[PDB]
Nucleic acid binder design. Sequence first.
DNA 1: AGCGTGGGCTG
DNA 2: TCAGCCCACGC
Length: 85
Amino acid sequence: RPYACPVESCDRRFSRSAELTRHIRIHTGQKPFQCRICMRNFSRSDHLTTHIRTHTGEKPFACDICGRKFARSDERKRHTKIHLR
DNA sequence: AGCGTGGGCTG
DNA sequence: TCAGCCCACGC
Ligand SMILES: [Zn+2]
Ligand SMILES: [Zn+2]
Ligand SMILES: [Zn+2]
């Protein structure tokens, strides 16, 4: 952890500089990415991409066992486990 | 379920 | 730096 967080009201530490810069947005409240469909702003581009799928209904990740589709890979990951029990 | 959102990390 | 994943946790 060669880089720490300046805001006295926070005890965070990171390995990289790009990480401390992305983190700082938590405190500055920066939300650079806007959804053109609902106008909601997001702190991250990747979260904006998946959020947009809530409007379009796009579901790229299908369960290997039943084929049920999901907007995000982690949603599918959480689901696949139910085929055990 | 639906889905917000930060951390770790790759490229 | 940004882009874009996985991963994780929360409600
Ligand atoms: Zn901080
Ligand atoms: Zn939207
Ligand atoms: Zn399934």
